[PDB]
């Protein structure tokens, strides 16, 4: 009938903190804390927490973390300020096929040398999406009226590496394990964990690549479904293999531009120049689209015809696929993949174009030159998701047209950090039972 005061009780409440735990490159795993083997994943009892997917602070903190980490890893590199000269350019004409005609340009310009009184005449191969006519015709680089670039150093590579996320001392991470989870609402499967699973900072804009798989069926997860603006991210049950390759032999030169600074320019091409086909298989794609179109019409309509179309974006990044294949950024058409009108070993090879000057995590005036990679490259990865967007008016609908789109880098990290939330302990608990201290 008096208070007692208890220390260490299992109450908690929501909070936000700062996090760590790398693995056991630009995503620096040398200045970090190594993880432990065999993490403490303790299965809790009857508690049901209200997990939210769209409001957790961890996604934004991850976004800020990768941004700060990226532009500290680009700091000790070559600043290509002498590269803004006039370029007199001509067509490449070697063994050019029907495509790739004018996509590359043979350019010749002036560039300073170590001894800072003597110049030189060097030549290089820039792409069509990298030079702008100023008006044998003169040319300049596209990024020489906003800011000069920073050439990515060949020593620091930028393949994705696994990391994990701790909670600090006195906090905890609650993990969902329910097999049917629609993003919001409660969950009767809550369990705690110290470091998260193998989260992988992949960069994509239309098709999620090399990520965490689903386990029973394809899961649609979104905001309020009546909205036309909110992304409707789909997670596949089984992966589909993707192969995108560049079948062109490249020669990397070492044009020296200052006292210990090198601009690695693209040389001549050994052999013929072909368009980069960017492949996927028919049968498994058709099967997975069948599974996904079965799991749309559970809550959208009941028998409305579901059709896809190709993307409609303004800039280059939203309207087409964008992904890394080892420092030689691709851009695949993905217009033969969404041309179906579903009612209820051959390939879908894609014209998969390519660009050197990149500007990701879009900020006003911070470009980055990507150096060429010698030889031919090929990547064997797999699609583990979709970033569709519904588009259509009619409430009394007879059809619903889905168009992929994408962008907004934040959403690729809210797709694999959905089963997680950080909480604050607050161990003190007051007024139990009858007592009376002497």
């Amino acid at each position: 009938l008096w208070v007692t005061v208890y220390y260490g009780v299992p109450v908690w409440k929501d909070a936000e903190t700062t996090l760590f735990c790398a693995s056991d490159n630009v995503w620096a795993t040398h200045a970090c804390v190594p993880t432990d083997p065999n993490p403490q994943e303790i299965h809790l009892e009857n508690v049901t927490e209200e997990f939210n997917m769209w409001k957790n602070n961890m996604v934004e903190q991850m976004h800020t973390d990768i941004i700060s980490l990226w532009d500290q890893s680009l700091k000790p590199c070559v600043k290509l300020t002498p590269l803004c000269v006039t370029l007199q350019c001509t067509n490449v004409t070697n063994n050019i096929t029907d495509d790739m005609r004018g996509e590359l340009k043979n350019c010749s310009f002036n560039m300073t040398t170590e001894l800072r009184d003597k110049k030189q005449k060097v030549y290089s191969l820039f792409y069509r999406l990298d030079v702008v006519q100023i008006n044998n015709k003169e040319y300049r680089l596209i990024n020489c009226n906003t800011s000069a670039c920073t050439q990515a150093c060949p020593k620091v590579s930028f393949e994705p590496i696994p990391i994990h996320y701790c909670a600090p001392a006195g906090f905890a991470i609650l993990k969902c394990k329910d097999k049917k989870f629609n993003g919001t609402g409660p969950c009767p499967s809550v369990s705690t964990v110290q470091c998260t699973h193998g989260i992988k900072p992949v960069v994509s804009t239309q098709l999620l690549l090399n990520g965490s798989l689903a386990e029973e069926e394809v899961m649609i997860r979104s905001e309020n479904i009546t909205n036309n603006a909110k992304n409707i991210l789909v997670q596949f049950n089984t992966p589909v293999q993707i192969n995108c390759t560049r079948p062109n032999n490249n020669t990397r030169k070492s044009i020296r531009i200052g006292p210990g600074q090198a601009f690695y320019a693209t040389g001549d091409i050994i052999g013929d120049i072909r368009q980069a086909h960017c492949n996927v298989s028919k049968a498994t794609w058709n099967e997975t689209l069948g599974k996904v179109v079965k799991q749309l019409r559970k809550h959208f309509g009941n028998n409305t015809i579901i059709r896809f179309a190709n993307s409609s974006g303004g800039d280059l990044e939203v309207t087409t696929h964008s992904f890394n294949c080892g420092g030689e950024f691709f851009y695949c058409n993905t217009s033969g993949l969404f041309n179906s009108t579903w009612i209820s070993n051959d390939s879908i090879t894609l014209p998969c174009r390519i660009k050197q000057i990149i500007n990701m995590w879009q900020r006003i005036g911070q470009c980055m030159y990507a150096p060429p990679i010698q030889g031919v490259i090929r990547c064997v990865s797999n699609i583990t998701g979709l970033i569709l967007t519904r588009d259509g008016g009619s409430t009394n609908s007879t059809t619903e047209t889905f168009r992929p789109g994408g962008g907004d880098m934040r959403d690729n990290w809210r797709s694999e950090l959905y089963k997680y939330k950080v909480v604050k302990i607050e161990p003190l608990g007051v007024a139990p039972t009858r007592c009376k201290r002497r």
Binding site: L1, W2, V3, T4, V5, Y6, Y7, G8, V9, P10, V11, W12, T17, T18, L19, F20, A22, A28, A31, C32, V33, Q40, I42, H43, L44, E45, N46, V47, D65, S68, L69, Q72, P168, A169, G170, A172, T192, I425, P427, L428, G429, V430, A431, P432, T433, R434, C435, K436, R437
Partner: protein, 121 residues
């Protein structure tokens, strides 16, 4: 191990108060760890300062003598330690803890009279 005692009854969570308490103190990516450890130290010292001020310090079950009523809950012990948990109990006391924290500010008054006033020859 750690807090898998939530969901269990009040009467079963009182025997496991320490394993949830020993895990309370245990260039970017480098400064964040420093801020985290500093923050953990601040929270632990704040909690121990509150226990030290309250008179009962270092004791898990540190039974004091501040009276109840029906206002700061009227639910009897026949249900709140046979069925009900800690998490649900935090909910119904959530806007009532502050005055009780204030009402526990008497240990100083009855240690100036048990030590400074009494025990004089």
């Amino acid at each position: 191990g750690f807090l898998g005692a939530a969901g269990s009854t009040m009467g079963a969570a009182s025997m496991t108060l320490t394993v949830q308490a020993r895990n309370l103190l245990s260039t970017v990516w480098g400064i964040k760890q420093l801020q985290a450890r500093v923050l953990a130290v601040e929270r632990y010292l704040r909690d121990q300062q509150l226990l030290g001020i309250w008179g009962c310090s270092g004791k898990l079950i540190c039974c004091t003598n501040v009276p109840w009523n029906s206002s700061w809950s009227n639910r009897n012990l026949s249900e709140i330690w046979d069925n009900m948990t800690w998490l649900q109990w935090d909910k119904e006391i959530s806007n009532y803890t502050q005055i009780i924290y204030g009402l526990l500010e008497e240990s100083q008054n009855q240690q100036e009279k048990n030590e400074q006033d009494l025990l004089a020859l």
